[PDB]
Structure 1
Amino acid sequence: ERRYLPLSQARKSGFQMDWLSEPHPVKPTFIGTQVFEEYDLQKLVDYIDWKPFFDVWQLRGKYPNRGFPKIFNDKGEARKVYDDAHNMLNTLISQKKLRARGVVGFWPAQSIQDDIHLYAEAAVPQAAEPIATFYGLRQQAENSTEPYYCLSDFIAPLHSGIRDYLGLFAVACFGVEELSKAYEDDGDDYSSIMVKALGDRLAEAFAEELHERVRRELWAYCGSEQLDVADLRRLRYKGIRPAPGYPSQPDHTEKLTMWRLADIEQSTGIRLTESLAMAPASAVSGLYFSNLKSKYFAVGKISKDQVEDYALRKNISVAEVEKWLGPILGYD
């Protein structure tokens, strides 16, 4: 008996930016991509969010493998895993046994209804064929009233007379899978767990630091920003970096467009697997939105009308859309 608003009505009640009263989006410092063939891993250490790392060790530490430090047999563990993490980081960074690569890109962007079109640097968007499209999905489930969000709501309409921009990034830590296997071959499960956890921390730190670098320098829509790492975790900054597959746009296949547009694989070695997971696994990607009114949200469950409309926009079958949007189908 769950109620869903028909797509046309959800669109009429979409999030309204009031573009007539909006300031002009800032043009990024370049259009196209910038590639990082290496990155300063020591600098990233300061951006690490240690909570998920301690979560890993709480989970694994309850059932220690043979060969764990003696402290796991006590009635202390957090300090020991933290110190061991720092020793490993020092050794692996200095020996260059871990390395990071990434890419950032920016393009002119404008919205048409639920979708975001990107254009060539020198193009007049109204006069030009888009070079890429990032498709949006819109909230539909029922519960003035709150708007029905879609990521396209955060980008200026094609006909608004306002030029907008969209960015993207992909980052990864390389060497993790190889080191973990080597540790395991040596019978050292503790170090394997450790390097896997650290790889994840480094990739996320890279995403965080690079986002700050994008806000202040590369896009520079907030050049005066001066926030601590703790404030970054709390999302005290403006703009968002949502990745395909996450609740704001659950369609993983949007990664294909990111990879094509920014030539990500040939630029960074970061691959998309058949399930559209990133390889190496210690990797993060996303689209950058600069509007200070942008926010994360969950699309939530959607109706058949939106699935059909989305299929037509992407030129794929309903069955194909239903494969990738399975968990958010609001119908049988």
Structure 2
Amino acid sequence: PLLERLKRRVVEGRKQGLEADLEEALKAGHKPLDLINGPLLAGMKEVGDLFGAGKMQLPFVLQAAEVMKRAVAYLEPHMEEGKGTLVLATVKGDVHDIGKNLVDIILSNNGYRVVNLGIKVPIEEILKAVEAHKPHAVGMSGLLVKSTLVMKENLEYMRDRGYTLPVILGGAALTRSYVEELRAIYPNVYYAEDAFEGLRLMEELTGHAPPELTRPRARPVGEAPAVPRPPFFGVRVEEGLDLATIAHYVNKLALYRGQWGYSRKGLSREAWQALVEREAEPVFQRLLKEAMAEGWLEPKVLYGFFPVAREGEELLVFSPETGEVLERFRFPRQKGGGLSLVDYFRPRFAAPLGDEADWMPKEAFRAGARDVLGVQLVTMGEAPSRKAQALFASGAYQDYLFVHGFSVEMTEALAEYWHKRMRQMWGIAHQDATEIQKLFQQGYQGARYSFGYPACPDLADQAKLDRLMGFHRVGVRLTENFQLEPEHATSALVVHHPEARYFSVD
């Protein structure tokens, strides 16, 4: 009756009057340990089952996790180990902790001890924690292909040093079949698609569940009608940036679905329209207002234009002062010799289309530059990472998810806004829509390409952009895996060519 109420309080996620009910339980015969192991955990189990069915959204799971967190905190003085220990780390060179920290929340509030070592953790630091704590498994996380090769190298090191403990790998670029191939290196390695697979693996490994998981041709790219003149050549900084203006360019469906994990599949269209207006849209307004007042988004842009030319399959970047070739980008071509990014750039020493010899930088034009490439790096600073880490540490799990996702999509909004500003500076903006819904058709002249996209997939090519721009100027650095630190930061090549578009290689 009371125990059913405490079990309901987890599932529905009802904070207010929890401490009154727990106080009544202990004086009516029940022990603090039996409340945690009995009704509070039983609710947390059914939260995970409802997520497996597709009946419960991810923000309500973290609201359920918060009730368990508060329930244990109030029961800590009165009590007078857990199911098992997990060492958990994002791999060397990798800055992304959202996937990992969701694994920390679900496993901790399902009873397991979780040692979270943080981001950019070398294998030596990981295995020092293995010997200190003596866990039932290690958990390794990483976003992109370079991080997956660090995971491989960590397994090579682990097999060589003589470890045989279970290793759980999670990652976007990582697939199930690739982890099966890594069992050539390290036999006791397992793939986890999400946190709840990580929970199943740990239950199977520790001995609380039976072993099942642990068992045509493209149209020709012509000449552009002109090469447009930029306002300047070089790279410049913009800092005075209005967050209310930036907020207008957010992909709200990418925020609400992609980052926060509200869903239309397990609900009706009436309940979707309700869920956005009731829950999601008020959080957006709250975070925007709070971010303006407190100042935990710090919008900055490093932007510029360089004289360029195609030579062969390479794009050459020339110095606007000296005309010396600073960098060479080689982009991949589609199979059967289709489209490449270099097809949008004019050949070196080619006959000018109009009056580009009047305004192209003198030495770069004499060295053969016949085109211009826009470059932008945008960031919201280290401040949103600092704010999210404070919310995580204090145990506000729902607000951690909300602030992380908001910070991701506000950085993308700043990239969208600045791309529009680059087009206006360019003189290619006059075919844009004034309103933002039409920009999600890609309704403008040219395109924006981030490194890691299909048409320019090598994240190493960010290093060339850093040498050209100087990422330090807006507080941004590259890791050993060429990811941007802090994570709320994204760079792009900006292409004027009217035929330019997104395309894949396969």
Which residue does the alignment assign to 1:118? 317
2:245 pairs with 1:43: yes
Q: What letter corresponds to residue 474 of structure 2 in structure 1?
A: T
- How many residues align structurally? 262
Q: What is the CA–CA distance in structure 2 between the aligned matches of 1:206 and 1:295, rounded to whole Å?
A: 20
**How far off its partner does 1:276 sit?**
1.4
Is the CA contact (8 Å cut-off) linking 1:271 and 1:278 kept in structure 2? yes
Which residue does the alignment assign to 1:102? 301
**How far off its partner does 1:15 sit?**
6.5
Q: What is the CA–CA distance in structure 1 between the aligned matches of 2:449 and 2:250, rounded to whole Å?
A: 19
2:462 pairs with 1:272: no
Q: What is the CA–CA distance in structure 1 between the aligned matches of 2:318 and 2:401, rounded to whole Å?
A: 44
Is the CA contact (8 Å cut-off) linking 1:166 and 1:289 kept in structure 2? yes
Which residue does the alignment assign to 1:299? 505
- Deviations for 1:262-299, whole angstroms, at most 9, x for unmatched residues? 011x2111121222111221222110110101111112
Q: What is the CA–CA distance in structure 1 between the aligned matches of 2:429 and 2:263, rounded to whole Å?
A: 41
Q: What is the CA–CA distance in structure 2 between the aligned matches of 1:130 and 1:14, rounded to whole Å?
A: 30
Of 279, 290, 293, which residue of structure 2 is paired with 1:80? 279
SS of 1:181's partner is: helix
- Change over 3 Å in CA distance of 1:239–1:18 after alignment to 2: closer
SS of 1:132's partner is: strand
Of 406, 414, 424, which residue of structure 2 is paired with 1:206? 414
Is the CA contact (8 Å cut-off) linking 1:171 and 1:207 kept in structure 2? yes
SS of 2:446's partner is: coil
Is the CA contact (8 Å cut-off) linking 2:432 and 2:445 kept in structure 1? no
Is the CA contact (8 Å cut-off) linking 1:98 and 1:176 kept in structure 2? yes
Of 453, 456, 461, which residue of structure 2 is paired with 1:249? 456
Q: What letter corresponds to residue 384 of structure 2 in structure 1?
A: V
Q: What is the CA–CA distance in structure 1 between the aligned matches of 2:327 and 2:219, rounded to whole Å?
A: 23
2:499 pairs with 1:288: no
Larger Rg: 2
Q: What letter corresponds to residue 244 of structure 2 in structure 1?
A: Q
Which residue does the alignment assign to 1:150? 340
Taking structure 1 as the reference length, the TM-score comes to 0.73
Q: What is the CA–CA distance in structure 2 between the aligned matches of 1:109 and 1:16, rounded to whole Å?
A: 21
SS of 2:414's partner is: helix
Q: What letter corresponds to residue 153 of structure 1 in structure 2?
A: D
Which residue does the alignment assign to 1:131? 326
Q: What is the CA–CA distance in structure 1 between the aligned matches of 2:230 and 2:470, rounded to whole Å?
A: 19
- Deviations for 1:142-196, whole angstroms, at most 9, x for unmatched residues? 4xxxx61110000101132232100111111122211111112222111111110
2:410 pairs with 1:195: no
Q: What is the CA–CA distance in structure 2 between the aligned matches of 1:244 and 1:80, rounded to whole Å?
A: 34
Q: What letter corresponds to residue 236 of structure 1 in structure 2?
A: G
**How far off its partner does 1:131 sit?**
2.1
Q: What is the CA–CA distance in structure 2 between the aligned matches of 1:25 and 1:182, rounded to whole Å?
A: 48
Taking structure 2 as the reference length, the TM-score comes to 0.49
**How far off its partner does 1:237 sit?**
0.8
**How far off its partner does 1:77 sit?**
3.8
Q: Greater relative contact order: 1 or 2 (C-alpha under 8 angstroms, separation 6 or more)?
A: 1
Is the CA contact (8 Å cut-off) linking 1:171 and 1:285 kept in structure 2? yes
SS of 2:501's partner is: coil
Which residue does the alignment assign to 2:387? 179
Is the CA contact (8 Å cut-off) linking 1:116 and 1:155 kept in structure 2? yes
- Deviations for 1:63-110, whole angstroms, at most 9, x for unmatched residues? xxxxxxxxxxxxx54322320221121012122122111211101111
SS of 2:306's partner is: strand
Which residue does the alignment assign to 1:69? none
Q: What letter corresponds to residue 437 of structure 2 in structure 1?
A: A
Q: What is the CA–CA distance in structure 2 between the aligned matches of 1:200 and 1:235, rounded to whole Å?
A: 20
Q: What letter corresponds to residue 155 of structure 1 in structure 2?
A: F
Which residue does the alignment assign to 1:92? 291
- Change over 3 Å in CA distance of 1:60–1:226 after alignment to 2: closer
Q: Which is helix-richer, 1 or 2?
A: 2
Q: What is the CA–CA distance in structure 2 between the aligned matches of 1:136 and 1:15, rounded to whole Å?
A: 19
- Change over 3 Å in CA distance of 1:114–1:122 after alignment to 2: same
Is the CA contact (8 Å cut-off) linking 1:103 and 1:170 kept in structure 2? yes
Q: What is the CA–CA distance in structure 2 between the aligned matches of 1:260 and 1:98, rounded to whole Å?
A: 26
Q: What letter corresponds to residue 107 of structure 1 in structure 2?
A: F
**How far off its partner does 1:117 sit?**
0.9
Which residue does the alignment assign to 1:319? none
**How far off its partner does 1:61 sit?**
12
Q: What letter corresponds to residue 275 of structure 1 in structure 2?
A: N
2:228 pairs with 1:26: yes
Which residue does the alignment assign to 2:71? none
- Change over 3 Å in CA distance of 1:248–1:110 after alignment to 2: same
- In structure 2, the gaps of 5 or more residues are 1-216, 266-273, 353-369
Is the CA contact (8 Å cut-off) linking 1:166 and 1:287 kept in structure 2? yes
SS of 1:294's partner is: coil
**How far off its partner does 1:118 sit?**
1.6
Q: What is the CA–CA distance in structure 1 between the aligned matches of 2:243 and 2:499, rounded to whole Å?
A: 32
Q: What letter corresponds to residue 291 of structure 2 in structure 1?
A: L
Q: What letter corresponds to residue 440 of structure 2 in structure 1?
A: R
- In structure 1, the gaps of 5 or more residues are 1-12, 63-75, 301-332
- Change over 3 Å in CA distance of 1:61–1:16 after alignment to 2: closer
**How far off its partner does 1:24 sit?**
2.4
**How far off its partner does 1:23 sit?**
2.5
Q: What is the CA–CA distance in structure 2 between the aligned matches of 1:14 and 1:251, rounded to whole Å?
A: 23
SS of 2:437's partner is: helix
Q: What letter corresponds to residue 277 of structure 1 in structure 2?
A: Q
- Between the two proteins, what is the percent identity of the paired residues? 24
Q: What is the CA–CA distance in structure 2 between the aligned matches of 1:254 and 1:185, rounded to whole Å?
A: 35
Q: What is the CA–CA distance in structure 2 between the aligned matches of 1:133 and 1:27, rounded to whole Å?
A: 22
